[PDB]
């Protein structure tokens with residue numbers, strides 16, 4: 001079997017992408033943030049604190065004839081951005097782009113932090129990292145991919161994120177019409193539960209390529225590209241007026257600037273992020289100060305290849321017995 005679903009930017013800045021997911025019988029369709037940096041499928045629900053819901057579509061397990069309480073299971077998660085949520089767990093039928101999983105753990109939110117409440121376009125998350133990160137206790141649960149893997153024609157999923165445009169998540173097959181040239185595969189470490197790999201280097205604009213190993217994770221649930229301070233300094237030094245601002249929270253630059261591209265290495269191959277992809281607009285409405293799409297990972301403890309980087313490629317998450325990551329231009 002296979003699945004194919006369209007993923008859509010939640011706003012003008014591609015701050016995140018939402019994908020429709022069918023849950024229960026009859027289907028309840030919720031727009032979920034597919035996150036390869038986490039491993040919980042959680043949703044706004046009929047159980048979520050009333051004052052913490054503001055515009056979101058909710059999952060009502062009591063309206064689903066195939067929902068079953070997973071007795072005594074609870075979950076609690078916190079993300080790299082400071083947000084968090086928690087609640088209880090049902091199993092139900094979950095379908096993504098025509099691909100169906102029965103008995104999927106659907107983690108129902110009792111509580112969500114203010115940033116979740118504040119975003120009416122995201123109805124929850126669907127984790128696609130390794131199941132060892134799943135937060136359900138006392139019985140840890142499997143991600144959707146993991147549950148589906150057996151059924152798939154090939155044990156893979158692919159992320160084809162758009163720049164200011166819809167993209168696609170495919171399950172169980174590689175669409176050879178979706179990328180240019182060939183796919184370069186690279187080794188993955190599963191030891192931290194992430195799709196963790198090692199980039200071979202970088203270039204700033206038309207600059208010479210710097211060969212250097214940069215460990216990082218492929219994280220569709222993170223908006224920006226977070227890299228070592230050396231790398232990031234080297235990038236912003238090419239932008240007149242760019243500065244790191246502690247009051248703002250990172251690098252900002254003149255909104256009048258034209259940004260240089262950023263190239264990252266995948267083995268012997270190169271993925272080029274166009275400069276426009278690195279522009280995240282005014283730090284505040286009307287401001288002439290713009291927020292950068294490449295930021296320091298110093299203080300995160302890990303480098304993150306977030307949407308800014310992934311959307312410049314066709315990315316293959318290969319969940320074979322020995323997982324690997326593939327990158328192609330498109």
Ligand SMILES: CNCc1ccc(Oc2cccnc2)o1
Pocket residue numbers: 016033035037038079080081083115116119122125221222
């Ligand atoms: C806006 N804060 C809540 C929110 C929206 C999407 C996500 O999910 C995240 C955020 C950061 C890292 N990984 C996943 O949280």
